[PDB]
Design a protein around this ligand. Structure first.
Ligand SMILES: [Mg+2]
Ligand SMILES: [Mg+2]
Ligand SMILES: [Mg+2]
Length: 197
RNA sequence: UCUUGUGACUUAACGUUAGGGGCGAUAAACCAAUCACGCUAUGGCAUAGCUAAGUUUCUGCGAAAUAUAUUUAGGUAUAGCUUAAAAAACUUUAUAGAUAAAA
């Protein structure tokens, strides 16, 4: 934390404490779904949108070792429990946090309720796509693949996102451009358009 | 062994002054076997935060010697001590980009 004036007060006025780092470390230290469940049970009353967003990615990391078997039972239970927090904080997420929520829940082959997806999509539909700029390159590639995997088909959502990302396409990394290209080929309403070209 | 031994002497009988007192060539001396207030009865089973003592058996539980205040310091009061696998809570501190399902 710093009090020096600067060009970006949005990312400089954020308050960072030791207690938040303590909880985030515990989540990352968990080595199994059983351990992660106990960590979340102890911290029930001290979970915030940042913690919820990070936990969803943890499920993705934990299931990578279970390459052969299907999704384990404790992983499914954690996903259901987390969704209760997502609904509670549906209007208190940032574009970066929403980006990693969808990716985490999509990697477990889980489907989000249509009402919840509509609420989360407001991050890019509101403020005429201003919040898209705040998102960095890593956030953008997860937004495209995450929402595409969820089966979310909304012309207004995809039209606004495409317009706000078009200027930055030439300067993204090659892999990120490839990810966007695959998503476009899967959506009929984006074929043979300026965005595709 | 020593002092005085006709004198401010010694002795016998009876009498006078009484304790908030008497008497005293003053030693606080004497006033019925030891007086800086006699003896006896009563108030009176005076008062003692001090010392001593406290009488048959069996079963169960079980301390303290610190703090504060005190005409208080070897007394007493208050607090402390002793008797009388539930619920709830998450604590010894700081951080990432790992998924690829469609001719
Ligand atoms: Mg004298
Ligand atoms: Mg005992
Ligand atoms: Mg006084």
């Amino acid at each position: 934390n710093t009090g020096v004036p600067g060009p970006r007060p949005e990312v400089a006025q954020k308050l960072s404490t030791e207690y938040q780092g303590h909880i985030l470390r515990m989540i990352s230290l968990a080595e199994s779904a059983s351990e992660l469940d106990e960590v979340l049970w102890s911290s029930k009353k001290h979970l915030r949108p940042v913690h919820i967003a990070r936990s969803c990615l943890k499920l993705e990391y934990l299931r990578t070792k279970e390459k052969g078997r299907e999704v384990s039972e404790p992983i499914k239970n954690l996903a259901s429990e987390l969704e209760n927090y997502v609904e509670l904080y549906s209007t208190k997420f940032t574009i970066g946090q929403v980006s990693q929520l969808v990716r985490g829940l999509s990697s477990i082959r889980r489907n989000i309720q249509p009402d919840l997806l509509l609420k989360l999509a407001a991050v890019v539909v509101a403020d005429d796509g201003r919040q898209v700029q705040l998102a960095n390159e890593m956030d953008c590639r997860d937004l495209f693949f995450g929402f595409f995997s969820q089966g979310f088909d909304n012309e207004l959502f995809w039209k606004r996102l495409s317009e706000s990302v078009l200027p930055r396409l030439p300067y993204f990394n090659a892999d990120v451009v490839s990810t966007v290209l695959r998503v476009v080929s899967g959506l009929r309403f984006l074929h043979n358009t300026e965005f595709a070209h």
